[PDB]
Amino acid sequence: ASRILLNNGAKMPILGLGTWKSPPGQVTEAVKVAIDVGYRHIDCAHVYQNENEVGVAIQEKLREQVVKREELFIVSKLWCTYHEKGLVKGACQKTLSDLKLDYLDLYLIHWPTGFKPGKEFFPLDESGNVVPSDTNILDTWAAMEELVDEGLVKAIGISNFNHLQVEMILNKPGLKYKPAVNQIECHPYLTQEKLIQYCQSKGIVVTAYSPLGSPDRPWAKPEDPSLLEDPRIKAIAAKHNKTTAQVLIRFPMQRNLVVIPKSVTPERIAENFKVFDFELSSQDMTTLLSYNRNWRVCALLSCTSHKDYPFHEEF
Ligand SMILES: NC(=O)c1ccc[n+]([C@@H]2O[C@H](COP(=O)([O-])OP(=O)(O)OC[C@H]3O[C@@H](n4cnc5c(N)ncnc54)[C@H](OP(=O)(O)O)[C@@H]3O)[C@@H](O)[C@H]2O)c1
Ligand SMILES: O=C(O)Cc1nn(Cc2nc3cc(C(F)(F)F)ccc3s2)c(=O)c2ccccc12
């Protein structure tokens, strides 16, 4: 099936286009090609610095009546320097304005950590540590609930929250809306069995990011493991007559996850979508799970002392 049911009663396409690192001069065309070839979900964020250009693509395909708004599922994320209650509506509204939308289908708390507000996305002290804000998870969650009650977003969720942080929201005094999604890093080197079972058991849908191991991440090092070059995964692709990327995309799909591979390459945008026509066996799935090594693309050193850092934590 192409969509999964959310606890807000709306349906979310299980394949989306990622847009982190998509250059602003290429992501308009990338999103247009995606929509043309079947993508109906786009993963966005203010911190990606390209929502304007994403929005150009969305608006042109709406204008051309390639798709209707109702059929698109657009996600963005509240950045860490906007966790204060008084900054949240504005941050959302700037995102909406850039994306050329009147509402978002899902808005996420991007990271559990609030940073000092200002023009800087990563405010640092003189020694390179991130500067926190004294905001807490639960006050930010209340501000996100207000966005639903203002019609600006259809669903709210979290990202990069560990089990206990999810649990803190689920147990929030006066909780009005449960998180719909937890978007977390997930791939054969970071399989997340624990956190995913917890979230799903609570009816929270999990979106897997960096499903290909983010080969274009700017801090990649030659000795880092490489999913797309792992001979073991290549072998499973060859057995199915598919590419390695297609295996790495289909893998989270069979775990009842949403997956959001990023590309600005039209050939790969189309290839990445052609994953609904084959199945990995249960053994392939367990074999892929066996490659776990708790390797993270996204865990920035400058943030590891924030009080709310999520990954000290067994899960
Ligand atoms: N919530 C969060 O904190 C968070 C964190 C990280 C990422 N995300 C979201 O997750 C999305 C995906 O994660 P990601 O961007 O880190 O990386 P990814 O999707 O794992 O990998 C993207 C990289 O893979 C290449 N690629 C794509 N399709 C390919 C294919 N078929 N064959 C070979 N290479 C291929 C891309 O190259 P080209 O683009 O040159 O084709 C790009 O270098 C992001 O863009 C963002 O939307 C969210
Ligand atoms: O954010 C993305 O979508 C991609 C993303 N990831 N990272 C690695 C990060 N690691 C973090 C760790 C925490 C922590 F919560 F753990 F403290 C908080 C915030 C971050 S950003 C980045 O540094 C980054 C920089 C610009 C744009 C996007 C990103």
UniProtKB/Swiss-Prot annotation:
Tissue specificity of this protein: Highly expressed in embryonic epithelial cells (EUE) in response to osmotic stress.
Secretion signal span: none
Binding site for NADP(+): 9-18, 210-272
A Pfam family it matches: Aldo_ket_red
GO biological process: C21-steroid hormone biosynthetic process; carbohydrate metabolic process; cellular hyperosmotic salinity response; daunorubicin metabolic process; doxorubicin metabolic process; epithelial cell maturation; fructose biosynthetic process; metanephric collecting duct development
Keyword Cytoplasm: yes
The EC number(s) this enzyme carries: 1.1.1.21, 1.1.1.300, 1.1.1.372, 1.1.1.54
MF annotations from Gene Ontology: aldose reductase (NADPH) activity; all-trans-retinol dehydrogenase (NADP+) activity; allyl-alcohol dehydrogenase activity; electron transfer activity; glyceraldehyde oxidoreductase activity; glycerol dehydrogenase (NADP+) activity; L-glucuronate reductase activity; prostaglandin H2 endoperoxidase reductase activity
Residue positions binding substrate: H110
Reactions it catalyzes: an alditol + NADP(+) = an aldose + NADPH + H(+); all-trans-retinol + NADP(+) = all-trans-retinal + NADPH + H(+); 9-cis-retinol + NADP(+) = 9-cis-retinal + NADPH + H(+); 13-cis-retinol + NADP(+) = 13-cis-retinal + NADPH + H(+)
Protein location: Cytoplasm
Residues with Phosphoserine modification: S2
Residues the record marks as site: Lowers pKa of active site Tyr: K77
Active site: Y48
Sites bearing N6-acetyllysine, chain numbering: K94, K221, K262
Keywords: Acetylation, Cytoplasm, Lipid metabolism, NADP, Oxidoreductase, Phosphoprotein
Modified residues (N-acetylalanine): A1
GO cellular component assignments: cytosol; extracellular exosome; extracellular space; mitochondrion; nucleoplasm
Subunit relationships: Monomer.
Family: Belongs to the aldo/keto reductase family.
Protein name: Aldo-keto reductase family 1 member B1
The encoding gene: AKR1B1
